[PDB]
């Protein structure tokens with residue numbers, strides 16, 4: 001695991017994407033590079049002791065659908081230091097950075113039954129007012145909740161499931 | 174053919190092509206300004222980079238200098254010629270007399286009997 | 287089905303990668319086929335995404351990267367009960383005596399918590415032993431811990447064999463012997479001795495020897511404690527003999543660095559105190575049953591300053607300190623009467639007479655030690671006549687501490703002696719009061735009661 | 747385009763004709779002071795004897811991830827990178 005390695009390259013990439021008005025393109029290009037990172041035979045090549053420049057060219061060759069500024073240079077700079085496995089991490093970092101700048105929160109909810117649109121709309125507005133962002137709710141129908149809902153906004157969470165209240169009363173007892 | 178990539182005190186890192194890397198005790202020669210310096214290989218690192226020891230002063234060495242790969246270890250004169258003379262580690266004459274008239278030179282890395 | 291794969295084999299430490307759901311938890315067991323050999327791994331750390339770092343309970347040789355691993359969802363579990371009596375077992379509770387299956391009714395996990403504070407039971411039921419100096423300087427009670435401290439070759443094993451003979455035979459309850467890091471020959475000799483004496487039917491034996499990889503030497507003590515605690519929970523009084531606590535700590539030290547830990551003061555692991563405490567707080571006498579334990583403690587370089595003996599001093603009721611100095615001088619057992627003590631040596635717990643006798647002996651020998659160098663450099667006749675009387679009585683007392691053992695009969699060529707506590711008190715009281723001032727020094731050397739001293743004096 | 751793009755990567759990698767190390771084979775990637783590092787060699791046991799060029803043999807003592815650390819039994823100044 002190399003989150004901290006991904007943060008420098010991810011900051012460089014994101015800071016560059018807003019200088020050239022192509023955040024939406026940069027995100028999918030980073031996804032493209034991550035898919036290259038996932039390949040079995042490419043992974044063996046990455047495990048080899050090739051020199052960084054020739055390894056970077058072997059990597060570039062399978063990713064011709066990349067721009068000069070974005071792909072050919074970031075791949076080679078990462079290859080100089082062997083941090084190509086950080087591409088998967090850079091992608092997630094890049095998404096979070098974007099969500100910060102655009103004042104958005106990917107608030108996640110879980111429910112024992114499907115919510116009506118009015119209920120979901122009230123929850124959306126209520127979290128936009130609890131927070132200071134445009135929320136984007138996504139729901140999952142899990143019977144483990146038994147009833148009530150879960151609301152997660154990253155690290156923060158609000159639990160309204162009856163299972164939580166049941167076991168809370170059990171711990172009060 | 175190769176280039177210096179690091180200079181750390183007495184040791185120097187040199188990069189060679191992936192198919193033209195010198196052996197573990199081969200000798201290299203570099204031009205430090207107007208004078209020539211001899212480097213001796215110690216370790217083969219990954220990617221064609223080798224660690225070397227400088228047989229001389231290391232000051233003045235810029236990175237990015239080109240090197241020549243000699244295809245033999247350090248060899249010194251031996252025998253009747255080296256019998257009244259003062260000599261350096263590389264087998265060069267140190268007294269201000271002329272050259273050593275040797276018929277044979279031996280590599281200094283040999284095996285015990 | 288198999289669920290994990292090996293990714294690193296560094297020395298004795300193995301890393302296994304699992305799916306990020308259902309990762310094995312700490313102190314679990316895992317299984318892998320090392321060729322035809324079934325090999326058990328014990329999980330020690332949950333680290334990174336889906337990876338656990340483990341210790342092999344067997345030889346790590348023959349392992350390849352990419353081998354499948356099957357995760358058993360329980361810790362290492364061992365047979366417990368009457369079926370373990372009279373059988374030799376390894377760390378995993380597998381028979382190594384070639385008598386067949388154990389035949390157990392119940393199996394118990396070797397990792398378990400210590401008794402709660404209110405479960406503890408207080409006891410002052412003094413045990414009597416035949417050894418003079420131990421009963422005099424450090425008497426101990428049923429349900430307590432005893433530790434025999436000593437350097438290399440000072441008499442730990444001989445004393446423990448003598449104590450087994452003296453205590454266990456009168457004891458009617460079951461006993462457990464945990465051979466932590468023992469020499470193979472001495473384990474075989476112990477097994478055959480018990481088999482001949484017909485006391486093997488009430489002893490359970492767990493042996494993890496010097497040749498085995500570090501995990502076995504690390505966990506064999508816990509196996510022994512598990513068996514002893516089964517007997518304790520049945521309500522019986524148990525005798526637990528542990529051959530070396532030192533090599534439990536040392537088996538920890540060998541693998542500590544490979545687990546990613548930063549080294550401690552003297553190269554030990556950073557977790558020495560906790561690793562000692564978790565093991566040694568389980569060896570207690572609760573209200574349901576009592577465990578009485580005797581432990582042999584190695585002293586590196588014969589220096590009691592080392593952290594291992596230093597920390598294990600703080601865990602024991604009675605500590606018999608053997609010294610290489612007294613062993614080199616030829617006095618056997620080599621107990622140091624000035625250093626050895628017991629917390630049962632109270633005028634309330636023991637006879638008031640007993641307490642005064644012990645205090646007087648210690649005072650006299652302490653006074654001799656300061657005069658040793660004085661006399662050595664300046665001469666015997668520089669002393670006052672009272673000082674010369676004190677010197678005489680000191681040498682006689684320091685002879686009377688010696689004793690022949692039944693199990694130390696092969697080394698010396700003499701019969702073994704057993705002395706009752708009352709006789710020991712009477713003899714030392716007589717010596718200090720001067721009733722035997724006129725006997726020579728050897729009249730007290732290597733004898734039993736003081737009546738035997740006067741008999742040998744007549745022969746002298 | 748998950749399936750499409752993964753197929754695209756597969757076909758370009760196959761057309762490039764790059765290939766995995768064969769199991770029970772590897773390449774030396776570092777030689778230093780009688781100790782060598784080897785890439786590949788998946789089916790390598792700890793304590794196994796690995797055959798070097800020549801009749802020399804090496805003991806594989808350390809099985810790291812993406813590397814095998816071995817000790818040369820004899821003179822080592824003749825070895826280099828790229829050796830199978």
Ligand SMILES: Nc1ncnc2c1ncn2[C@@H]1O[C@H](COP(=O)(O)OP(=O)(O)O)[C@@H](O)[C@H]1O
Nearest residue numbers: 438439440441442443444618619691694697698
């Ligand atoms: N009471 C004794 N009588 C005679 N010899 C002894 C006595 N105690 C120790 N020794 C001698 O010292 C040796 C070393 O002590 P031992 O107990 O065998 O190992 P350790 O002391 O290291 O556990 C014994 O094997 C024996 O030779």
Ligand SMILES: [Mg+2]
Nearest residue numbers: 442443444582
């Ligand atoms: Mg011993």
